[PDB]
Amino acid sequence: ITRLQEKEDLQELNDRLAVYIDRVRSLETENAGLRLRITESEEVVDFYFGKLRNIELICQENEGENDPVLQRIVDILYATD
Amino acid sequence: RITRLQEKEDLQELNDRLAVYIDRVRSLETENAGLRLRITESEEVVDFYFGKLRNIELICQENEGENDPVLQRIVDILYATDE
């Protein structure tokens, strides 16, 4: 239709393709980060779980003393929701 | 010059090159949402555990005066790291 139109029919198509390579590329990097954020979370779950487990042990160890502070702690440990 | 079959192939070829990019973005955006559920589901557990540890911290702090070595052992665990 125009000599300079075929220039912007060529360029429009080129820039449309570009934004797809820029999507795949940045979707690939977001994706990589999420894989590491998932490993970091699984690590923090264990780290916290370890603490709660050792705290449970110290409480079971002192069952005899019937300290109501330890019972309050145990009530927290075995809580739900 | 342009053969009637080279214009049939140049068409299909492009229409396929574009098709593998939409199929990449698609499956990449699918994988991305599956990672997002995974990380939010893990973070929910992190928060549940964090909540207990934090409430336990408060109890040890309000009994600071008691100087109970059991509580000190407990706060030692709370502030502990692997180094």
Side-chain angles (χ1 to χ4, degrees):
Chain A
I1 280 198
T2 300
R3 179 58 180 164
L4 281 294
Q5 183 266 45
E6 48 205 16
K7 186 217 180 188
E8 59 191 286
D9 217 298
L10 184 100
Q11 198 65 9
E12 184 147 26
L13 179 295
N14 193 41
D15 72 56
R16 259 152 203 164
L17 194 70
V19 300
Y20 273 59
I21 65 104
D22 288 334
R23 194 62 187 121
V24 145
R25 186 62 207 131
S26 66
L27 203 60
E28 260 172 10
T29 173
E30 172 161 47
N31 224 248
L34 294 172
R35 251 178 297 260
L36 285 182
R37 289 301 181 174
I38 173 75
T39 75
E40 188 207 276
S41 195
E42 283 187 347
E43 181 70 339
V44 173
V45 161
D46 302 319
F47 172 70
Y48 284 176
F49 183 82
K51 300 195 164 341
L52 290 166
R53 192 141 193 91
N54 287 105
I55 289 163
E56 185 186 331
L57 153 74
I58 284 169
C59 293
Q60 281 171 308
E61 206 147 74
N62 297 36
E63 262 166 7
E65 220 286 295
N66 284 101
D67 192 355
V69 321
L70 300 191
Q71 177 74 83
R72 200 154 148 223
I73 282 177
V74 151
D75 295 323
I76 286 173
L77 293 176
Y78 297 113
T80 57
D81 295 60
Chain B
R1 209 188 80 116
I2 295 306
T3 307
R4 204 188 184 107
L5 61 81
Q6 195 71 75
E7 44 211 11
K8 174 106 168 132
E9 284 168 24
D10 275 19
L11 180 94
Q12 182 68 43
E13 172 71 347
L14 177 294
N15 198 34
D16 292 334
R17 273 174 186 187
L18 203 59
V20 298
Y21 273 61
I22 64 105
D23 288 331
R24 200 172 223 129
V25 146
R26 207 90 88 189
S27 65
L28 211 55
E29 82 185 355
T30 300
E31 179 155 29
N32 222 74
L35 291 173
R36 285 181 146 123
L37 173 67
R38 213 149 88 71
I39 170 81
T40 68
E41 267 192 336
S42 194
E43 276 304 312
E44 281 185 341
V45 177
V46 164
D47 292 330
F48 173 71
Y49 287 175
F50 177 79
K52 305 194 162 330
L53 291 169
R54 185 214 42 216
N55 292 327
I56 283 165
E57 201 203 6
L58 291 182
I59 290 184
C60 294
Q61 288 190 193
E62 65 174 64
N63 292 23
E64 265 169 15
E66 200 197 339
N67 201 28
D68 188 1
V70 157
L71 296 187
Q72 175 73 88
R73 196 179 167 174
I74 290 169
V75 321
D76 279 349
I77 285 171
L78 287 187
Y79 300 140
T81 63
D82 318 329
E83 286 220 13

